[PDB]
Amino acid sequence: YRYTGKLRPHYPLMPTRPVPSYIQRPDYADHPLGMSESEQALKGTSQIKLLSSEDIEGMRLVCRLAREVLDVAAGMIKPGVTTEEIDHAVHLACIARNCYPSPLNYYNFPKSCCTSVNEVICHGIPDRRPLQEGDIVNVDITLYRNGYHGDLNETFFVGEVDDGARKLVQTTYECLMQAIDAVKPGVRYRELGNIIQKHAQANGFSVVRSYCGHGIHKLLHTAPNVPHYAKNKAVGVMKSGHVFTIEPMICEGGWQDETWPDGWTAVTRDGKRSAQFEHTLLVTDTGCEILTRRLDSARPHFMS
């Protein structure tokens, strides 16, 4: 394998972390290849679930607990801390809230969150690498509670970063919020990519094509598919009671991605940095509820 940048994996990983049996487990948790029977049963559908009031309560709960856990991770971002150490804390924070860490054994994913540094786009595997001053790192939290998943991510700065890093992360957050600000009944899912790419391109950045926002509720991902680039072919129209994520991945260089031999770590093919932010959204009559919002601050952590 030819690495695209400076980052490398830092192995071995610590033994897989157990989740006590009193925590309710998704179906894939105990599948030997981490496949989800419930996902495979709905695989190939484009029907978008309209959530019941029960579903809404379930999504509000798991999304706010997910936020609490991301906030735990945010409080640990400093030079010297390893991404494995963040994952350990995230794992304990999930259990402390009677939640299962959704990534764990998802298609045999080995950890309890995704930690994406610099040229990593998404799905980085927590490992023994200490964060370095100047790094950008995204922590992506997915939790599972009472049958529902919730999903959010932020990119953080590690100590002082360069101006490129500041501009990339700010622009990405702006992309996310502009997209969110357009969500309401009657808008085509395909429109959000036009808004995101417009802002990205205006700032000299590109938009990752191979990963998308997604429906989420009783499945970790389902319809709709929500691409972040312009003139995409996404199917479907927003309606009150839809829940989905928006999670733009923006890049300093070109948009092309490739995957490490681990089968998960997605990286820019050119080795330049990529940043991401993500919320889980519930469409309402007036617009949307941001289920994963920060409750104790108007702003994401990088703005501190």
Ligand SMILES: CO[C@@H]1C(=O)CC[C@@](C)(O)[C@@]1(O)[C@@]1(C)O[C@@H]1CC=C(C)C
């Ligand atoms: C729609 O896919 C999703 C996508 O494109 C955006 C990035 C991911 C990670 O959310 C995604 O790739 C998922 C859901 O397949 C990945 C499996 C999830 C975990 C936490 C390992």
Ligand SMILES: [Co+2]
């Ligand atoms: Co996510």
Ligand SMILES: [Co+2]
């Ligand atoms: Co997501």
Ligand SMILES: [Co+2]
């Ligand atoms: Co899947």
Ligand code: NA
């Ligand atoms: Na990155």
